[PDB]
Every structure is written in C-alpha cells, then in structure tokens.
Design a protein around this ligand. Structure first.
Ligand SMILES: NC(=[NH2+])NCCC[C@H](N)C(=O)O
Ligand SMILES: NC(=[NH2+])NCCC[C@H](N)C(=O)O
Ligand SMILES: [K+]
Ligand SMILES: [K+]
Lengths: 253, 255
C-alpha cells in the first residue's frame, strides 16, 4: 500500500450523510496508485481483505499525491453508499418490489428472462462516482443521435418502463434529485444533468448528479435507464422470452 | 498446508502422457481438505499464486488422508491437460475452425451470446469438455431430470448429423474418436476399459455424454467426459438462425 484508508476514516465521512444508517461493510483499504504522464491520468487500485480489488482512473487537476488520491477514493466510497441512504434505498425497493419481473443485483435492476443463476435484461443501472459528461463523447460516437427527455413528466416514464413501473421509477429519480439538491447542496446550486441517447435497438437516459460533501471536492452519481425498442408488453417480446435456449445460456468467467 | 503439490510433481506426472508437450502453466499448489462424515465426502481446495482457487468434491473409498487427496488432485490435473495433447488439441481445433459460429472459451465450445462483465462471456454451449468427470457419477441426477434415455451409436455418422448438423458432424465424430483412441491406446488398463456413451432426452434438448477411464502410473484413474448438446431445433435452421441475431441477446447479463 502506498497508503491506507482505515474503515474508521470511511465511517466518519459516511456519517456526515443525512439518512445513512446501514452502510456497506467497511474494511481497511490498502491503496496503490500510479501516475501516467502520457495521457495525464492516475490509476488507483484499492484492496481489502474481504472484497476483490477495485480500480479507478481519474484525471488530476494538479500534481498527484496521496492526499488527492485519498480524497478521490473517499468520493467513490461516499457515492457508493448513497444507495443505502434510507429514502434512496426505499425508493429503489419500491421499484424492485413493484414488479415480479424486476430483479436486482444491488447496482443493476433487470428484467428476469430465464433461470440458469438468473438471466436479465438490464433496465436500471446505478453508477456511483460517474457523471454523464465524462462519458458523453463515447455516447455521442456510439449512439445514433441524442434526443430530449422532459425531466418531471409521468408520460416520459410510462414510455421508459411502462405504466406498471412509471410512478415508482419517476419517484426514484425524484428521490435522488431531491437528496442531491437538499442534502448535498452547493452554495451555488448544482443542476442535475439529464441526457437521452437513441441507439439502433434501444433508448438510454442518463440522470447525473453533483453533490457537496465536507470531505471531498465532489460526489458524483448517475442513474442509467434503458428502454429496448421492442415493447416488453407484447409481440416479439413474448416470442423471444419463451424461447427455451435462454435458460441454457452459460457464463464463462 | 495441509500439504503442497509442487509444479515439478505435476510436470513429472504430465510428462508420462503421450503427445503432451505444451501443458497448462504449472505452479505450486497449496491443498486444503476436510472430510464430511454425514455424506461421506471430501471437500478439497487448491490455491496458486496466479490463478487460485479451485475446488473439488469426491467420495472416498477408504479413510481419507493426504496421500489420497494428493493422488486425487493429480488425477484432475492430468485430466485437465489431456486437452493439450497434440492429437486431441488438433481434433478440437478442427471442430472449432470448421464453423465460424463456434467459439471456444474455457472448456466450452458454443455460440457467443454476450460479452457480459469483466471478461465474462455468455455462451450457448454445444460441446463441453469435462475433465475429471464420468457420467456414471451424475447419471442419477440426469435420469431424474430428463424425459427418457436413448441409445447412441458412435459408429454412425448420421447420429452425429442429428446432434451437430452436417457442417460439423464429421469433425465432431473425429473428436470423439480421437479421445476414444487416446484412452484405449495411450491410457490402457491391463483389463481394457470400455468407453461410456449415454444419451439423455429432455423436453427442450438432447445431451449425449462420452465418458472415458484412463490408466496412468501415478493415479488410480483418469476420468474425462465430453458432453454434446442438441437443442430443440438445429443450429443452421432458419427460425433459430434469426434468434441468435436478435439484438437483445448482446445486452443479456447474469445475476
Ligand atoms: N465530472 C464532473 N465533475 N462534471 C461536472 C462538472 C460541472
Ligand atoms: N465401473 C468402473 N469404473 N469400474 C472400474 C473400472 C477400472 C478400469 N477402468 C477397468 O475397466 O479395468
Ligand atoms: K421483484
Ligand atoms: K470458429
């Protein structure tokens, strides 16, 4: 470890978040980092005893040191535990429990399509520590075009996730929007970013948020919602979902 | 601890295999094991520096000890490296290169589905290599979960045309033959072991298991099974062929 982040340091940072009482398991983190002069980026590896090593890459705005990397890793841990804030956790739980076909990882909500282990089409992905502006270039390149998305409108969410889930999903976005605006407020209020991209086969909507936390420069969080072009309600979807091959798709590590 | 298997012991055992020249990377193994008296089984854990951990479960035929577990783990390593025997590796390559839709990943030859997460590949299996496994040890589970059993004849190419259609039938038949000849001629017992062929019919697929038992100087037995799956409709069929190109498949993920 170039340096260590104790679990107590993490818990003290997480304790400044409103409504957080059941964070993820926190262990001492051994942090390694290397600076790359060619592309001006820092590669960070975090190792704990229980979980497997996570890695990050960020672009430094001044010469890298341990203090900057420590602050960056904290911002990722803070963002990672927003999902466990009471009202945010409850808002996601209402989405998942409101649909027997929805099953959750913890970071991905997907439509259950087959049993293996389970097979899913992702529709909601939680992306802590990510903002859409940092990936918009590849999104513009790989998508057909960018569309518009009305932020607070129930009919938009009926389109995205159907009437069965529209209000729950809309409340999930609103819960994150309110939490960042009221509980992670900057002196100069940050506005949420909403960006919609159309692909050959799907619509993707990104909801990105910037939050103020005492111990870091910025807390980033993005929620991605996917709508596949064929309506999940009927037609080709029923032909596709009943094909028995799906229950024999194998995952090779 | 509880005992180690150095890479030299592994390489010495592997060097007795005819036609093996490019084995898998070999490292020292740290082996842990524990006996379970309720179901009379031994659970084994094997750890290396580069690609740990592997796990096994077997049923001991006498009171377990290190020497038995060491022999068992060696038999799994030997079976694992049969895939790299020249004529067996070549016979597998002929199946793989004989179909642009066939891809190989790990012990599975099949149809690519999705690229998943962090190096994972979602694949529809067609041929599965199963080193260290014999069908007689899973047949009870297979009989209960299947509709019925059939009789499969390895002499007949048309039955391989049923399994993997005509584009792959002869390459696949030669793959089975290569393993059949290798075990009979290169891993022979004094009392010859006959290969096991068992076909199982499910509602949605047919699975044919080709199992083999091999004699090796350092272990009681070498086991190897090849599983071939035919699904409800053949691969080159039209109504299927449009299914593997549905764009949804690339977005599939596993929990
Ligand atoms: N990557 C970011 N923090 N983006 C937000 C900039 C305003
Ligand atoms: N059912 C069995 N696997 N019996 C042991 C067979 C041993 C050896 N393969 C032989 O035939 O001589
Ligand atoms: K559910
Ligand atoms: K191929």
């Amino acid at each position: 470890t170039q340096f260590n982040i104790t679990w107590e340091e993490q818990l003290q940072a997480l304790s400044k978040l409103d409504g957080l009482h059941h964070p993820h398991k926190l262990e001492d983190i051994s942090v390694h980092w290397v600076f790359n002069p060619v592309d001006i980026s820092v590669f960070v590896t975090c190792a704990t005893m229980s979980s497997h090593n996570t890695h990050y890459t960020f672009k430094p705005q001044s010469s890298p040191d341990d203090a900057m990397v420590r602050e960056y890793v904290l911002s990722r841990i803070i963002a990672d535990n927003l999902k466990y804030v009471d009202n945010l956790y409850l808002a996601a739980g209402a989405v998942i429990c409101g649909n027997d076909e929805y099953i959750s990882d913890g970071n991905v909500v997907g439509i259950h399509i087959a049993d293996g282990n389970k097979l899913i089409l992702p529709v909601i992905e939680f992306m802590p520590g990510v903002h859409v502006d940092d990936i918009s270039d590849k999104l513009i390149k790989s998508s057909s075009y960018q569309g518009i998305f009305k932020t607070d409108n129930l009919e938009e969410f009926e389109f995205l996730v159907d009437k069965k889930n529209a209000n729950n999903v809309k409340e999930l976005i609103l819960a994150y929007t309110d939490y960042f605006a009221n509980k992670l407020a900057f002196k100069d209020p940050a506005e949420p970013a909403v960006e919609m991209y159309q692909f050959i086969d799907r619509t993707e909507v990104y909801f990105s948020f910037e939050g103020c936390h005492p111990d870091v420069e910025e807390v980033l969080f993005t929620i991605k919602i996917v709508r596949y072009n064929q309506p999940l309600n009927s037609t080709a979807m029923q032909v596709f979902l009943k094909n028995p091959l799906l229950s024999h798709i194998r995952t090779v590590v």
